[PDB]
Amino acid sequence: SRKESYSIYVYKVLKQVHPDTGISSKAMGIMNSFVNDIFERIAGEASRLAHYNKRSTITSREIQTAVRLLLPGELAKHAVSEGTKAVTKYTSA
Amino acid sequence: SRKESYSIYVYKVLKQVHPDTGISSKAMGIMNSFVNDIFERIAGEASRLAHYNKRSTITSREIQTAVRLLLPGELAKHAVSEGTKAVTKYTSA
Amino acid sequence: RYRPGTVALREIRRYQKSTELLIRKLPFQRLVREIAQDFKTDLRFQSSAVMALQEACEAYLVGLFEDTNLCAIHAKRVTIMPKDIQLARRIRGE
Amino acid sequence: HRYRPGTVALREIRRYQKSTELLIRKLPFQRLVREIAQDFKTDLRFQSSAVMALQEACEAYLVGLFEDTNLCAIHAKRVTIMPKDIQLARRIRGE
Amino acid sequence: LRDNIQGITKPAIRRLARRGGVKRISGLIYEETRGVLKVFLENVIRDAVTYTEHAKRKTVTAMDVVYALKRQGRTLYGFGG
Amino acid sequence: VLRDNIQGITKPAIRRLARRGGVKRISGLIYEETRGVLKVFLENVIRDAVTYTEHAKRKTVTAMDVVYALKRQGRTLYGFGG
Amino acid sequence: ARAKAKTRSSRAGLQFPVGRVHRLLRKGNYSERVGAGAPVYLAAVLEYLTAEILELAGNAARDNKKTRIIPRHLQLAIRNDEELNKLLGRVTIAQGGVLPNIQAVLLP
Amino acid sequence: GKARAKAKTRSSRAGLQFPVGRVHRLLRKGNYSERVGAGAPVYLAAVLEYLTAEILELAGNAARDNKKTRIIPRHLQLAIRNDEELNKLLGRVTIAQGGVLPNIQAVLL
Amino acid sequence: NVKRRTHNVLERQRRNELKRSFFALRDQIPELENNEKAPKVVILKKATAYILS
Amino acid sequence: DKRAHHNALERKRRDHIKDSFHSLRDSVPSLQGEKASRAQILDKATEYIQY
DNA sequence: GGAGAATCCCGGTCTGCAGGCCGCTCAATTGGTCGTAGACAGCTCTAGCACCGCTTAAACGCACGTACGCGCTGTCCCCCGCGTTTTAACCGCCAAGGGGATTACTCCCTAGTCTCCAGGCACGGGTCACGTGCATACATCCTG
DNA sequence: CAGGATGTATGCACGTGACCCGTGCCTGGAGACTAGGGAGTAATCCCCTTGGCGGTTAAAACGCGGGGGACAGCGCGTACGTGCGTTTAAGCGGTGCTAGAGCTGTCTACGACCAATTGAGCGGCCTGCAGACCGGGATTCTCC
């Protein structure tokens, strides 16, 4: 029996963001559900965008558009920058 | 160059509900918007119900449950009765 | 001359019975295009797209004015005021 | 000595907004959930976590309602909340 | 199990109003509040039991509550999901 | 260049909107307030309709892009598509 | 079960197209597999709701001495019916207008 | 951007902590589309990680302000409701055991 | 506008009366007994023929 | 253009109909030489066929 | 300015939970083939835009009066703070068993393929309903 | 009271837009068949929930006094409503030009799919630390 969660990555990100600071299991559960919800929103909107067009594939364009739609104000700009940077580094060399 | 619509079935139902009453083109466009919205609601909710239960298959049980969840009051009980009758009749031969 | 507020009731009935759009079309086209230009330049609009925007935005303002009325009545007034709009939007979450 | 009417109300507001506790007693809330469940399917078992989730949701919902209700009272130039305020809050909210 | 809505005492309503920032509570608020709460609970529990019944379980799990609240536009974080 | 067309939302137009909504008397400041509200609402719908248009690499905003923006905000619209 | 003309709609007794509803359930990726009775049940539901609205819209049309359904009638049919108003309460209807209602405090 | 570090794991190859593999698996099994492009999970993992970093930064600030070393749900709620963009992103969300901001209105004082 | 509306509805009822007259004439002619959809020109011409016969 | 042609076809239809009415009027003795409405021509044709 | 109660700071105590380590299974990664979705070039034609003149309804500016909104006052009732008494939640503990979780096995229904035909679509033709303007007949007011 | 000028009510002829019917054509749906996987069933185990017990306690209920607030009435002055004449821009019909949407046809680059190899990370365990809790005192807010 097994169950998979994002808690290990939440912990790593916290260790980078505030290196001396811990996180209680309840906060971990909330962060885990936050990751689940945001994933579901972006994937749902990317699906809706793919299906609004006559397109079978979810690509980084569907996701960039979905992030511009879903996130408010500055948060969209920074998230779009992060996504673009990651795909750039990943496809580079 | 073609695109499909529910207008013909809307009109047949109209004639069976009221023996003599016509419908305008704008009202017919509204009815098509309605049919597509209700379909998307039920089909989407049925997706949830299958996914939550680790099932790959949308069955009558999922649609029935989606109807109970989506429709209020009397509409639920009667929609379920109508759907059950249609499936039983369809299955009888 | 009629008692003040009488012609308002006549108007309420007239406009609730009718279905045509209340805001003039050419001004709303200019408004929509002016707003759109802030997001992207050189956009064309489908003739029906602006009609969808009128239908939705005008129906939204009708709905907001209806709630705006309730706030004034709760405060024991007849006259609606900016506080009513702000309360309605605050409770709605706009 | 006696604190003036409203002083202790402000002290309570400070206290409870500083806290994060559940404000309804758990056991009678659980009995309420079970009473309501007897309408929908006789003889269910409830996970303890499901009762906690229900209670947290209800308390969060009612606190939100009371914030909106306080606005309705204040807009009416009144300190005291009344059913008119709750009904207006819900009607504007669309319930 | 009957009359358990009385388990929601006036102080519980008053404390919830204190978190709501309320200074004074008229006496009709308590009855109105209980009516509003009971409606909310009935809706949430009916949906949770619907998920339970579809899954052929006899046990309501926290996930049923979460999936009920999601459909109301009220996403809840903390109990899984 | 289109500028200041929000003034085209006239006092009579706002008055008719309110009367249809059941309003009997209208304060002189409601016109200033309602224009602001309408501008906010239009911005939020048009931003998304443009975003759909831009995603699709189109230059013409369609009625379907508007309907999708409205469906997305929970203010679904019938008669312009579905 | 008396009727048995061979279209799946006709076998079910429905006016709505079962084959089309089956395509639409397979598309959109609602799930990996779709049961044979799924589009039948769903078509029956869509037809029932369609008939309910058309019934009330015809009643509204007769109340206005009209022989034809127009958007105004659809709006009235929905907004004067609690179940449909809850189902479609978010929905704006093109050229539908609004209910004829005035608050009592505004009247003499 | 930053120079490539050689690695097997797609996260390490993308410069991310979040798991590109698990995000890809969830996109494929979740029925979101018939097909999922190779760059899609990389973009999505970067977005999820960024948002996670924002919340944890604000929450750690709130924890320090409360003179405590571990983030707890109260700090998450404080972090959300004091930031306008996060409060717009999470406006409908209820956070278990978060409480509320200390809202006392001036007319009461 | 009430005057214009009144003239229009009166003429509309006159059109309904004329339709009753056409349908009465149509139903009188056995060749058109089942042909309820018969157009005005056909009713007139076939009525003329039937009358002469 | 095609719209104006359809209007022309409809005009021609009504012209043929007025000719048909004139023929029918002349066919019923109760209206021969008389001035009458289309409703009267139809009603007298009806009651004359009955008679 | 004084007496009193609520809140905070400080030190000391114990505990449950957080955090790190080990072995391990299962999901992630690698390398290649295969078929398809999508990118791209090219062409046709509709829908959108710009501009004009003309007729007309809707908005604008102005003057005028009073229903209403606001503030002030007096009154009476209702809710809070408090003390005393009563009630049930909470906590810790135990026991019984039902029902959630898991595996192993079998059968039935759904996905996919190929063939063929029927229902629905786009289009054109004919009929119909409706609104507008002209000619005719009927009723009211003015003159003597 | 009779006749003319005017207003009112009626019937007839015309143009515009919409609806209903019929024809030919193609895509889409159904029928027959197959192979494969998913879901249904039985058997099993353990976890969690249900129920009950005892004692302690905070928290609930109640009554009372009292103060502060909710409510109705009154008068003043303004901002708004309501009506007119002038000005403005909308709405309509018409003409022409062109951007882009929409479609077809060709081809390559991409992800699905598979088998084989491997490590990140999951589950359980041990260990120590930040948190909650208490007692004691001083500082700050509240009521006179």
Author numbering:
A (entry chain D), B (entry chain H): 32 to 124
C (entry chain A): 40 to 133
D (entry chain E): 39 to 133
E (entry chain F): 22 to 102
F (entry chain B): 21 to 102
G (entry chain G): 10 to 117
H (entry chain C): 8 to 116
I (entry chain M): 353 to 405
Paper's wording?
The basic helix–loop–helix (bHLH) family of transcription factors recognizes DNA motifs known as E-boxes (CANNTG) and includes 108 members. We focused on two structurally and evolutionarily distinct bHLH members from the bHLH-LZ and bHLH-PAS clades, represented by the proliferation regulator MYC-MAX and the circadian TF CLOCK-BMAL1, respectively. Structural studies with engineered or native nucleosome sequences show that MYC-MAX or CLOCK-BMAL1 triggers the release of DNA from histones to gain access.
To directly examine differences and similarities between bHLH-PAS and bHLH-LZ proteins, we determined the structure of MYC-MAX bound to a nucleosome substrate identical to that used for CLOCK-BMAL1 with a solvent-exposed E-box at SHL+5.8 (MYC-MAX-NCPSHL+5.8). A cryo-EM envelope with an overall resolution of 3.3 Å positioned the bHLH moiety (local resolution of 4-6Å) similarly to that previously observed in the corresponding CLOCK-BMAL1 structure. Unlike CLOCK-BMAL1, MYC-MAX does not contain flexible linkers adjoining bHLH and dimerization domains. Its LZ directly extends from the bHLH domain towards the solvent, where it does not interact with the histones. Although the DNA-binding mode and orientation of the bHLH domain are shared between MYC-MAX and CLOCK-BMAL1, both complexes differ in their histone interactions mediated by the dimerization domain. Accordingly, the relative affinities for NCPSHL+5.8 in TR-FRET counter titrations are higher for CLOCK-BMAL1 than for MYC-MAX. The palindromic E-box allows MYC-MAX binding in two orientations, with either MYC or MAX facing the nucleosome. XL-MS identified cross-links between MYC and both H2A and H2B, consistent with MYC at the histone interface.
